[PDB]
């Protein structure tokens, strides 16, 4: 960024090797911008012998070729095999570094073992590429912690539920559902499932999400392991499979709809088995579903997920949550019976929402109405929910006849 020079306090030290007692700070600044200017002119001319003589190393014979170029006398004794040693001297207030040179008896250089004789430069030919890729000749480049038992069991069970074949998956899920000692591997499975449902945002894979939801459904059926301590991780994973909007890679043909009602049945089971008044699981799940449904701007997929979960919770929930907003069906049929914009995806999701709504509101209409139901459909929104309610009353009569 800036012009970097040798420090001005390094020239007071040098001036006292000379014998100059007091040197003023404007003289020391005058010395160090000249000697750091001549260092940069031999740093960059040594680099011209490193580049033209192709070396990329900057040996000490490059600087000696550049001092020879600037007419300045050479520096003797820098071609021997040495390195960078420095020796700290603490002292009583004078901090410095020196060399600590060593000695050697003269007869131990006359009687040193001689190195081996060098070889002369010769040539060698070899193919580098033969009409294509390189040959494989040797002149070329070559190209708390789970025990091992349960580590292997975790590896095999998790890789059996990634989708190589269906039979190994069914045996892995029947292992997870029916083994007695799978504790100490429950936190690993919860982490695997929650992170795998998170990895849907990078790759919208419907199939791997169906596999992870069948992994959760198999974990719930195990009688021996208690998921009370780990349910705070599995609740938002199933919630993500319910109320997210893109569950598909190709939105139009992928049946994200089933991973919706499967995960809705799953979360109704997870708040039937685990909701306690200290937990407030079910009230906090209904509140998220409710403020996702009543709030406008929500896509038809996430509204489908909200209605699916709320309708799998039970009968009184659809009495006191779904039935006030039945007028919203009119806002739905605004975009179904009517509209030039027909070739969008907002029609298949809307009539899926419609079909789920009238399927779940038909027994609720069968519970809280008269037995006749003559023009209840006309009194209902769009006159279709009422036809579905008549069909539901007929189905109930058929069930009574079967009984």
């Amino acid at each position: 960024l800036s012009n970097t020079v040798l420090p001005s306090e390094s020239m007071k030290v040098v001036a006292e090797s000379m014998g100059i007692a007091q040197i003023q700070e404007e003289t020391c600044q005058l010395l160090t911008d000249e000697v750091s200017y001549r260092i940069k002119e031999i740093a960059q001319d040594a680099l011209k012998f490193m580049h033209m003589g192709k070396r990329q190393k900057l040996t000490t014979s490059d600087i000696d070729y550049a001092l020879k170029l600037k007419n300045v006398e050479p520096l003797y004794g820098f071609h021997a095999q040495e390195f960078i040693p420095f020796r700290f001297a603490s002292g009583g207030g004078r901090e410095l570094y020196f060399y600590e040179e060593k000695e050697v008896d003269l007869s131990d250089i006359i009687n040193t073992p001689l190195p081996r004789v060098p070889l002369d430069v010769c040539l060698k030919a070899h193919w580098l590429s033969i009409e294509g890729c390189q040959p494989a000749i040797p002149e070329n480049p070559p190209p708390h912690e789970l025990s091992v038992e349960q580590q292997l069991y975790y590896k095999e069970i998790t890789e059996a539920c990634v989708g190589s074949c269906e039979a190994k998956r069914a045996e892995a899920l029947q292992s997870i559902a029916t083994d007695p000692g799978l504790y100490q591997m429950l936190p690993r499975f919860s982490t695997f499932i929650s992170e795998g449902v998170r990895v849907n945002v990078v790759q919208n894979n419907l199939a791997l999400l169906i596999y992870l939801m069948r992994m959760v459904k198999a974990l719930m059926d195990n009688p021996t392991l208690y998921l009370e301590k780990y349910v705070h991780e599995l609740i938002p994973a199933v919630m993500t499979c319910i109320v997210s909007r893109q569950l598909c890679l190709r939105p139009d043909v992928d049946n994200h709809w089933a991973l919706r009602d499967f995960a809705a049945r799953l979360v109704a089971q997870i708040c039937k088995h685990f909701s306690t008044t200290t937990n407030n699981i079910q009230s906090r799940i209904t509140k998220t579903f409710t403020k996702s449904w009543v709030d406008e701007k929500t896509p038809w997929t996430t509204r489908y997920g909200s209605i699916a979960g709320l309708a799998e919770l039970g009968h009184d929930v659809i009495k006191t949550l779904i039935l006030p907003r039945l007028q919203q069906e009119g806002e739905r049929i605004r975009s179904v019976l009517d509209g030039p914009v027909l070739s969008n995806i907002d029609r298949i999701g809307a009539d899926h929402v419609q079909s789920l709504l009238l399927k779940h509101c038909a027994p609720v209409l069968a519970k809280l109405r008269p037995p006749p139901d003559n023009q209840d459909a006309y009194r209902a929104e769009f006159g279709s929910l009422g036809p579905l309610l008549c069909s539901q009353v007929v189905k109930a009569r058929a069930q009574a006849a079967l009984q």
Binding site: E149, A167, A172
Partner: protein
């Protein structure tokens, strides 16, 4: 005491060496039984008895191309 009393005590830990040995032993036996039944069910299987896959399934013996590498070499080191 209920008017203004609070006892911030901890939770009694299990120091019973007998039940800790029993818990670790039974969990190791159960996870190795589950692992071997899963690996014998999802592969080629043998049987000491005629048509015996549910009870005592054996993982079938596969030949190695180089058997000393899987025999002599240590796996935990």
């Amino acid at each position: 005491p209920h008017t203004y009393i609070k006892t911030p005590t901890y939770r009694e830990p299990v120091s019973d060496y007998q039940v800790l040995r029993e818990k670790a032993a039974s969990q190791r036996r159960d996870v190795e039984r589950a692992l071997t039944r899963f690996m014998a069910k999802t592969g080629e299987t043998q049987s000491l008895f005629k048509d015996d896959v549910s009870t005592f399934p054996l993982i079938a013996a596969r030949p190695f191309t180089i058997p000393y590498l899987t025999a002599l070499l240590p796996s935990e080191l």
